[PDB]
Design a protein around this nucleic acid. Structure first.
Ligand SMILES: Nc1ncnc2c1ncn2[C@@H]1O[C@H](COP(=O)(O)OP(=O)(O)OP(=O)(O)O)[C@@H](O)[C@H]1O
Ligand SMILES: Nc1ncnc2c1ncn2[C@@H]1O[C@H](COP(=O)(O)OP(=O)(O)OP(=O)(O)O)[C@@H](O)[C@H]1O
Ligand SMILES: N[C@H](CO)Cc1ccc(O)cc1
Ligand SMILES: N[C@H](CO)Cc1ccc(O)cc1
Lengths: 427, 427
RNA sequence: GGGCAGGUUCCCGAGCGGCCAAAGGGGACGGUCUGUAAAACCGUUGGCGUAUGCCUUCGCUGGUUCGAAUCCAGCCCUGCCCA
RNA sequence: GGGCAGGUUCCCGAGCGGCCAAAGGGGACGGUCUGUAAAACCGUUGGCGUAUGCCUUCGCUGGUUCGAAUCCAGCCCUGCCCA
């Protein structure tokens, strides 16, 4: 694909690219551009949200450009204020580096690892030794009125909500990473406009070609309103078992399916529109199958498309009705979903042995058992859950909080619609 | 003097000491307290303004405490925003270190140098290696709303006047210097409240006894309104020749004499009040004599008082009329003042030889001569000055801008009331 | 990144095509009155041996016209409103 | 540094001396209806082998009273107004 042609593929599904005429230009230079993308391991594991920007990076690699993944072990220590309406809490450099592990491992599910298209870097490499005098020069490149001109900060300032002064350095620390690696393009979610812009500003200061800001739409999380985030618990991990990933995707609030196909799949608007035709449930089945299938593999395919869907063994014309077809892992997944919907037990449930000592008088109080089992944070809670008709013992809905369970033979504990644990005597 | 007693001597003439009960306490610890006082050599030479805080430091040394003079060669690079209503301009670390020279030399005119009472330090020693991570911790000790709560910043922000973000680090850089040397007390002009307070804040963060902020009144400069400053050209240098120092003090606007005696001398309110009795001119004579006398010496006396005034040979009862009395240097000084008032020539005038080549046709144009002499920035100016009846040749008020001066024998050039230069042929 | 308002001489600031080295105010400098003060008042506030001559100064770099501080073009910087 | 208003449970937030493990709203969790969705509705929202018993939780540390989340004292932190 020639320049003019690449700028298209890339431009598709993208929120905004500014300044676009510069990306079109850089493409014409016939040399691997440097595509930057950082992530602050404040919490482990990546998720479908990240997949939004990562699949895009992948696509840049696919057109021969090099991607540099910046693991913000340092920045993550400071905490990125973008969005947050409250100072993010502190994090030690040892912590962020612990999380980083997951990020490296996991990025691979979407990114290419071939050395000429992928470099890994932790900004703590070049940021710890940034000198006080050097900082002063960065922070002198912008004015107070400009910082406060940010959505996030404005609101907070006006609302009289504390803003730690250090929260103002973050933009610059991120900005530097750009200079650090002469980035041609910095990838990002829309909530990174500001940071990506300060990146251009700081690059000029260091006499470098101002990177091309590439913003991707933000994927909304399972709650329906807020964006997917590791801190909001509304995400679908990139490395959850197919069972889990499949069920969660079956829960993506209806009003979002359109967005999910656009940001997570490669289906033509037409194919999407016709899917919603079949209705909500059917679409979910499809969306779920694709992604559970895709992320099941060691690395997703260059394109999650109608063909890829069919290559699995499904009939696009079947619109999800063809449950039987499909991989012997996505199958069982969708299968577990349905059994549970019906109110049946999942085939494979986690067993958890219970030391005879934990017994008392030969039995064990249901309240405590559910806790010893990790289904309830505590007896009191269990009790409460039971009064609320929320736990089941061997399929039967418990009703006697004082119940004394007999662990002679295994038992199948249950909490809510889909949390199962088989337990037995081991001691 | 016991603690309770010291807290008094010190408290006299001082703007405010906060928190006072802490200084009273520290005094009782019977151990040399650490009195901090920094200065940013943005421009060379100290002046009577500085003398305000320096004489106070001296007094702390006089009661046995140790003074640590911090030469802000680093801070001076950043630029202290206090007061300034516009970002101070940049300064290289090599520059500030050039100026520093003057400051060390000159501080001595007021400060004691005995090692157990005086230490010299350039904060660039401990500030250059302050790490980015370390900075983040300093700037996290305060909120935006608090920075903007400053007189200086508020005004500017509201007034829509640019505030470089780096201007916000200065407080912290100064604050650190406190931690750096476990300062018990930081001295300062009232325009340093904020900085001195952030110093306590930052000390707590580093688990140190929050220093005692000691604010001294600001001495107003010769203009009459604005405070004396190296950047406003309204100062009287601590190391100007007695001639100069004497004449400038004879120009201290009347409405300020009270302040000048209080901040620069050690005369009881009573003595001051009775001086103003004699009237303006007489008081000036006295004020001038004292300080010109005092700063004439290699180091001022512990107290510029009525006794010291008399020890010079003056009659306090004479109220300045006794012009003859006095040192053979302060005498000639006051003498030059008067001759010039009368319109006479000063005895000792600076000569400046003029290379025959500079001649043209045997003469030299008055306009150019005044420039070759350093009395006028340029011919045009000279011409203009002359049209304005502002230059004199040999006592005669020039009137012919095209005049061709004859440098056969010396000539006495003059610009305004008191700028004289004798010039002659040398080549 | 996008919209609008700004960028001019020491500072702030007016600026129209040629009347622009460029209004006014401030500051500062000279001067008068004085006390080598203040106030008031009167001037000055790009440079060149002395000048229908040239250069420097209107954010930068180009261009239009005979002629650009004004106009056009790209870029830089600030405030506000955005994102 | 000084004045005033705040600091309470996952969040925001009411709080009076004992009625406080502490109102209400949000979120979240259970449940009903469903499509393992939404909306609506009904509950839950410190812990302890099962409890006129104790502990943890009202910014920190002390103290008053029989009894403190409420009161007093010093200190910490935030917003506004100051300096
Ligand atoms: N839900 C999302 N949808 C789309 N892109 C996302 C989403 N979350 C994060 N990203 C992108 O991934 C990049 C890395 O995110 P990172 O984890 O560093 O911070 P974050 O925004 O706090 O993440 P989280 O959303 O997990 O809080 C972001 O710069 C953004 O471009
Ligand atoms: N006119 C003055 N009157 C009284 N104290 C002064 C005066 N000028 C400066 N000081 C004091 O001297 C200290 C050192 O001043 P420094 O030269 O570092 O900064 P500055 O305030 O810019 O000085 P300047 O007044 O020369 O601009 C200040 O912290 C202040 O305490
Ligand atoms: N700050 C972004 C969100 O956490 C991630 C990041 C982006 C760019 C970097 O150079 C570093 C981190
Ligand atoms: N910032 C003050 C005025 O210039 C001077 C100063 C005061 C304290 C220091 O630690 C350093 C400099």
């Amino acid at each position: 694909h020639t320049p003019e042609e690449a700028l298209a593929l890339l431009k598709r599904g993208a929120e905004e690219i500014v300044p676009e005429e510069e990306l079109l230009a850089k493409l014409k230079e016939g040399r691997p551009l440097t595509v930057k993308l950082g992530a602050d391991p404040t919490r482990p594991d990546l998720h479908l949200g990240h997949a939004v920007v990562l699949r895009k990076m992948r696509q840049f690699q696919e057109l021969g450009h090099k991607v540099v993944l910046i693991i913000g072990d340092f920045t993550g220590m400071i905490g990125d204020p973008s969005g947050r309406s409250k100072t993010r809490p502190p994090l030690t450099l040892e912590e962020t580096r612990e999380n980083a592990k997951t990020y490296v491992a996991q990025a691979g599910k979407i990114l290419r690892q071939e050395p000429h298209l992928f470099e890994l870097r932790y900004n703590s490499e070049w940021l710890e030794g940034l000198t006080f005098k050097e900082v002063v020069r960065l922070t002198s490149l912008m004015t107070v009125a400009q910082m406060l001109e940010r959505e996030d900060f404005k609101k907070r300032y006006e609302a009289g909500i504390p803003i730690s002064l250090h929260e103002l350095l973050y933009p610059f620390a991120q900005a530097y990473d750009s200079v650090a690696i002469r980035a041609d393009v910095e990838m990002g979610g829309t909530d990174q406009r500001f940071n990506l812009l300060v990146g251009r500003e700081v690059q000029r200061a260091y006499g470098q070609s101002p990177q091309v800001c590439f913003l991707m739409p933000l994927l909304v999380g399972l709650d329906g309103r807020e964006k997917m985030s590791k801190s909001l618990d509304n995400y679908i991990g990139l490395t959850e078992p197919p069972e889990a990933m499949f069920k969660k995707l079956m829960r993506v609030p209806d009003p979002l399916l359109p967005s999910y196909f656009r940001l997570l799949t490669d289906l033509e608007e037409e194919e999407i529109e016709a899917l919603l035709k079949a209705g909500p449930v059917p679409a979910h089945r499809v969306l779920a199958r694709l992604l559970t299938a895709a992320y099941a593999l060691p690395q997703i395919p260059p394109r999650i498309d109608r063909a890829f869907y069919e290559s699995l063994g499904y009939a696009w014309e079947a619109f999800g009705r063809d449950k039987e077809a499909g991989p012997e892992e996505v199958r069982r997944a969708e299968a577990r979903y349905d059994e549970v919907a019906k109110g049946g037990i999942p085939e494979e449930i986690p067993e958890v042995t219970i030391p005879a000592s934990e017994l008392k008088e030969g039995r064990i109080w249901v309240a405590r058992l559910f806790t010893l089992a990790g289904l309830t944070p505590s007896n009191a809670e269990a009790r409460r859950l039971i009064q609320n008709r929320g736990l089941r013992l061997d399929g039967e809905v418990l009703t006697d909080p004082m119940l004394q369970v007999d662990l002679s033979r295994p038992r199948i504990l249950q909490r809510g619609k889909d949390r199962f644990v088989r337990v037995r005597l081991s001691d």
